[PDB]
Amino acid sequence: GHEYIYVDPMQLPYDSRWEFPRDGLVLGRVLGSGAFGKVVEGTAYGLSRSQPVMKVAVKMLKPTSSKQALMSELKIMTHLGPHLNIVNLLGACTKSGPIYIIIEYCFYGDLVNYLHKNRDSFLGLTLLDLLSFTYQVARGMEFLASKNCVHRDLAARNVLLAQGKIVKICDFGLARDITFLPVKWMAPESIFDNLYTTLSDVWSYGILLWEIFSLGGTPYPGMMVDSTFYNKIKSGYRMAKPDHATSEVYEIMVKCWNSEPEKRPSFYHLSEIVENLLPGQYKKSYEKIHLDFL
């Protein structure tokens, strides 16, 4: 079947429709950094018609092999398409200078900080909210898997909250189409055998759920990543139920942490389960928003 081939998004051309004048972008504070580079706050003039002056986030390499990785990140983002639970690419500065990737700025920030600041409220922040976040992330991950994308860095730091409490997944760069790494979120196959699949991301989703239902807790609390950590996880060690987690959600985590990647639940499958855990009215409202967005 030489006539049938795989279209690598890395070999596809860059549509210049995404180019933004570097003189139209004002850069500001460092919002943060992931595995590589940094994300800074910025103001863009002329990117949106509705908003002539719009606040944005900019992914860029730090002053310190990464340039093309950034370009690849741009490429995957360009071809992923739009989704409500996936942060949006607004444009890029790729000509005559360092690569700048312009992305949507989310008001409430990352879930980790949100969950932390609204911890005491958890007695604003409500259990239903947590489940909603869980559902939306599952949907966005389903979208990425549909697009044959393995994020490789699913975590609460990379799940953002936009206005309307709509979650957005961010931080590609470690993403691949079917270096320091986020071990406590990585599956055993990925760490020991360098194998990454959608199922590996499912493991990360479980770690994410523990983060959410621990209200911002650090995975494997107190444990330092070392020889013993790996031996334990290899032997089958798994984290215990988080304090604010139901048996039903912990079960989801347990499934996600099966040693057999093929036995872990799919994001499609994961979506339905969480749906049941929430009011059936939720699905409809979600769909409405998910149609308006487009």
Ligand X SMILES: c1cc2c3nc(ccc3c1)-n1cnc3ccc(cc31)OCCCNC1CCN2CC1
**157: Cβ–Cβ under 8 A, 6 or more apart, which residues?**
32, 34, 110, 111, 112, 171
Task: Of 173, 249, 183, give the one whose Cα is nearest residue 219.
Answer: 183
- Regarding 110 and contact with ligand X (CB under 6 A), the answer is yes
Strands (E), the chain: 25-32, 38-45, 53-60, 89-93, 100-104, 109-110, 149-150, 159-162, 166-169, 176-177
144 scored as a contact of ligand X (CB under 6 A):
no
Task: Fill in the per-residue mask, 53 to 92: x = in contact with ligand X (CB under 6 A), - = not in contact.
Answer: ----x-x---------------------------x-----
Position 160 contacts ligand X (CB under 6 A)? yes
Which range touches ligand X (CB under 6 A), out of 27-35, 141-149, 215-223, 244-252? Answer: 27-35
Chosen residue from 18, 22, 27, 31 binding ligand X by CB under 6 A: 31
CA-based torsion, 150, 154, 160, 164: positive or negative: positive
- Is 216 near ligand X (CB under 6 A)? no
Among 20, 36, 100, 105, binds ligand X (CB under 6 A): 105
Catalytic annotation present for 201: no
Closest alpha carbon to 136 in 173, 169, 90: 169
Stretch that binds ligand X, among 64-72, 98-106, 224-232, 251-259 (CB under 6 A): 98-106
Q: Which stretch binds ligand X (CB under 6 A): 92-100, 105-113, 131-139, 207-215?
A: 105-113
Query: Quick check: 24 binds ligand X (CB under 6 A)?
Result: no
Number of residues that bind ligand X (CB under 6 A): 17
Give the range of 125-133, 135-143, 156-164, 275-283 binding ligand X by CB under 6 A: 156-164
Rounded Cα gap, residues 81 and 149, in angstroms:
12
Give the angle 99-101-102 at the CA atoms, nearest 5°: 140
> Is residue 106 within the footprint of ligand X (CB under 6 A)?
yes
Distance of closest approach, residue 119 Cβ to ligand X, in angstroms: 17
Q: How far is the CB of 74 from ligand X (least distance, A)?
A: 11
What's the burial of 150, exposed, middle or buried (CB within 10 Å: 0-12/13-18/19+)? buried
DSSP 3-state of 282? helix
Tokens read off for 108: 């409430």
* Rounded Cα gap, residues 66 and 45, in angstroms: 28
Q: What tokens appear for 178 in the block?
A: 């079917």
Binding test (CB under 6 A) with ligand X, winner from 9, 24, 32, 46: 32
Q: Which is nearer to ligand X, 40 or 239 (CB)?
A: 40
**Smallest separation (angstroms) from ligand X to the CB of 101:** 8
Q: Which residues would be at the binding site for ligand X (CB under 6 A)?
A: 31-32, 34, 39, 57, 59, 87, 103, 105-106, 109-110, 157-158, 160, 170-171
The catalytic site residues sit at: 153
